[PDB]
Amino acid sequence: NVAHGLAWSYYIGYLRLILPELQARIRTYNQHRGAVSQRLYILLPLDCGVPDNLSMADPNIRFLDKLPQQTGDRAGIKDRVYSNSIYELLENGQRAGTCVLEYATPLQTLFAMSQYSQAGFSREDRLEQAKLFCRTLEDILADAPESQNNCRLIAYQEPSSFSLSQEVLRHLRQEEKEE
Amino acid sequence: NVAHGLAWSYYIGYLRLILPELQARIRTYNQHRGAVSQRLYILLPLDCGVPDNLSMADPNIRFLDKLPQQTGDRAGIKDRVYSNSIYELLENGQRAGTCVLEYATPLQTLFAMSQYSQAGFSREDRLEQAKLFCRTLEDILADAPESQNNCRLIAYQEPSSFSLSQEVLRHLRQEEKEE
Numbered sequence: 001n002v003a004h005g006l007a008w009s010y011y012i013g014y015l016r017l018i019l020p021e022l023q024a025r026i027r028t029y030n031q032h033r034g035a036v037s038q039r040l041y042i043l044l045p046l047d048c049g050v051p052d053n054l055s056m057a058d059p060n061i062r063f064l065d066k067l068p069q070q071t072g073d074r075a076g077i078k079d080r081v082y083s084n085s086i087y088e089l090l091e092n093g094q095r096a097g098t099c100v101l102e103y104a105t106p107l108q109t110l111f112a113m114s115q116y117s118q119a120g121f122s123r124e125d126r127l128e129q130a131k132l133f134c135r136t137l138e139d140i141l142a143d144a145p146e147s148q149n150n151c152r153l154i155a156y157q158e159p160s161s162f163s164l165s166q167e168v169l170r171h172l173r174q175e176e177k178e179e
Numbered sequence: 180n181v182a183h184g185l186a187w188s189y190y191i192g193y194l195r196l197i198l199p200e201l202q203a204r205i206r207t208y209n210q211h212r213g214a215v216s217q218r219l220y221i222l223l224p225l226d227c228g229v230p231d232n233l234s235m236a237d238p239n240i241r242f243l244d245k246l247p248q249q250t251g252d253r254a255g256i257k258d259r260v261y262s263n264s265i266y267e268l269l270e271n272g273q274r275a276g277t278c279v280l281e282y283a284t285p286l287q288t289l290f291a292m293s294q295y296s297q298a299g300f301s302r303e304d305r306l307e308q309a310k311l312f313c314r315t316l317e318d319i320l321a322d323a324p325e326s327q328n329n330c331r332l333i334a335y336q337e338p339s340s341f342s343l344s345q346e347v348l349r350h351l352r353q354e355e356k357e358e
């Protein structure tokens with residue numbers, strides 16, 4: 001049940017420090033083309049396949065720019081930088097949305113752990129732990145609307161023809177339906 | 180035993196990506212006063228008290244500068260920045276050493292978890308988990324001399340008159356004894 005600790009680490013050491021400041025950074029970018037959505041969209045692939053370049057996971061997800069970096073002193077590191085990337089979502093050659101998009105990195109940690117023999121984490125427990133991570137993280141944000149309003153969890157499982165851009169657009173449009 | 184997963188997360192998502200590049204960044208700073216030591220000194224307070232400003236933990240630990248930032252694309256974030264701070268260690272008004280110093284942030288996560296009721300982590304298990312983190316992390320680096328040569332773990336426990344700068348200097352001088 002390592003996924004439980006990674007979910008809490010994900011919130012304590014990240015979501016709870018950037019999301020209270022995200023709207024400010026979003027509106028700052030729009031001021032100083034297209035309107036960036038005001039939520040952090042977090043990709044939770046249950047197969048734990050976490051590429052580093054989204055464009056390689058789906059060409060329709062096209063990097064646009066970066067937000068204004070957030071900084072802060074943490075654990076003896078001066079000016080620890082929290083940066084986020086803005087992606088355009090394409091659909092049949094058209095820009096259907098623009099949002100701050102990224103994977104949940106701890107799912108990449110789960111994947112790596114399953115390969116290290118010293119970690120005592122079997123390759124078979126990847127899916128189960130990924131789901132415990134999603135469930136735990138969802139339960140955490142349910143008790144912190146400050147952060148829940150600032151992000152949407154996009155958990156998915158590829159069966160083999162899958163569209164990641166279409167998966168994001170579904171959440172991005174259901175959010176605009178209640179805007 | 181959440182400490183086990185945080186230790187592996189600490190290595191997979193950090194130590195294993197900066198330490199192979201640390202010497203290059205150290206020597207770059209010395210080129211482009213005093214010689215910075217060529218190891219990352221990581222503070223592991225077993226009481227899990229992890230301030231964000233080292234100078235507040237001990238005035239003899241004085242921030243000097245930052246290293247050249249390392250960057251890389253991780254989990255959909257373009258140019259994720261890994262930064263490190265250089266500290267001078269004072270001793271009776273004299274500069275006894277200079278090194279890249281910082282706390283192990285996951286110990287700060289353990290502390291926060293113990294306060295959240297939803298996390299199911301008792302306040303009493305802080306010390307035990309801190310030690311499991313130290314032990315686990317030490318065992319990981321023993322199997323990766325690439326990273327072990329590039330860092331020294333400084334685990335300590337305050338009894339109530341403690342000197343943190345003197346604690347670091349002891350490790351910094353034992354390393355120069357076999358230089």
Ligand SMILES: Nc1ncnc2c1ncn2[C@@H]1O[C@@H]2COP(=O)(O)O[C@H]3[C@@H](O)[C@H](n4cnc5c(N)ncnc54)O[C@@H]3COP(=O)(O)O[C@H]2[C@H]1O
Pocket residue numbers: 009010011012013014077080081082083104105106109188189190191192193256259260261262283284285288
């Ligand atoms: N700037 C950022 N950008 C994107 N995501 C961020 C982030 N800061 C935190 N997170 C998310 O939160 C997790 C836990 O962060 P934490 O700092 O407590 O725990 C971190 C931290 O103690 C250490 N670490 C990683 N990157 C670091 C950095 N740039 N500076 C200092 N420590 C770092 O490794 C642990 C695990 O890192 P990991 O990435 O796997 O897991 C991170 C990551 O998924």
